[PDB]
């Protein structure tokens, strides 16, 4: 609201907070990003390294659906199934492992950050990282590849 802003406090103060010497003039320095390679060079180099120039290949007609690959780490793996799924498997004696289907939860690749609980599991997924596969195998699990 306008009643809480500086203008109400700047009534009677001539310059309105812009100074008597420099004044508030229209566009000193240029408009927008003018001067980036010129009188504004220090700001751009100091705060925006890399801004000027070109790097890497072009790709025409990029379709971001083709590279769709949501990832999940192993430390969040057991959140995809219910809590009773884990405890029932942990306490059961037959040794049956539950199937966790990451694609059903909306993930494609499984990544290795984290530590799994000491509990066998069967993991279905399109992709696995190397370390994810070993951590899943270290607890007695198995990796299953889906398409």
């Amino acid at each position: 609201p306008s009643r809480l802003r500086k203008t109400r406090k700047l009534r009677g103060h001539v310059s309105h907070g812009h100074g008597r010497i420099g004044k508030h003039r229209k566009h000193p320095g240029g408009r927008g990003n003018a001067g980036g390679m010129h009188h504004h060079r220090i700001n751009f180099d100091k705060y925006h390294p890399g801004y000027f120039g070109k790097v890497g290949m072009r790709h025409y007609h990029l379709k971001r659906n083709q590279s769709f690959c949501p990832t999940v780490n192993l430390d969040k793996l057991w959140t995809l199934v219910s809590e009773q799924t884990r405890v029932n498997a942990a306490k059961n004696k037959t040794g049956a492992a539950p199937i966790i289907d990451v694609v059903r939860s909306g993930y494609y690749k499984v990544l290795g950050k984290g530590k799994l609980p000491k509990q066998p599991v069967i993991v279905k997924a399109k992709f696995f990282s190397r370390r994810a596969e070993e951590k899943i195998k270290g607890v007695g699990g198995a990796c299953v590849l889906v398409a």
Binding site: P28, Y47, F68, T94, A96, P98, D101, F128, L145
Partner: protein, 210 residues
Amino acid sequence: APSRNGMILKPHFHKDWQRRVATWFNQPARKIRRRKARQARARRIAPRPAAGPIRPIVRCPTVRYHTKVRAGRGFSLEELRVAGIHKKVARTIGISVDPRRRNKSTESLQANVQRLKEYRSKLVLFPRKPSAPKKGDSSAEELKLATQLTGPVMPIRNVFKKEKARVITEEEKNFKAFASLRMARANARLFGIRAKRAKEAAEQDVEKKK
């Protein structure tokens, strides 16, 4: 002028954007107008379903969405042919037809054929002349109970096949998913070049032979 740290911004306000501002103050009015036309349309076509013709099941394209099924545009002529519904008769009884759509696989085809057979089983058909029933018209006892259906006809849902826990076999334990994945990429990558090298070697060896 830039001032200390910040983001570099490029607002697209270098045209006469104020000459083409679209406000939305008529939004409540549109919602009432569209609602008032859904109701007036539902009354007009009653007891036919207000949602409209039944739509088939289709799988969304691309790898981001091919795990989902949704309502298509219309049943394919192959799906209607397998279900024994004439394509010109299909629309007259609330079935949507899409002559463009193809059937590449049988499962999707049979999924929509069962859909059409289930819908045909729920169809209550009023005789063209009320006093003179005909061969396929529903019996009077089930015409009394006919009531307009709200919401999409036989809504389409994504149902997941629950797999129960099973003992892991030594063969699954020994499978190497990452090594398999990396070698599969490499074989696809080098398949063409490997055959070209193989073909030259055959020619290279043959020339010495003969």
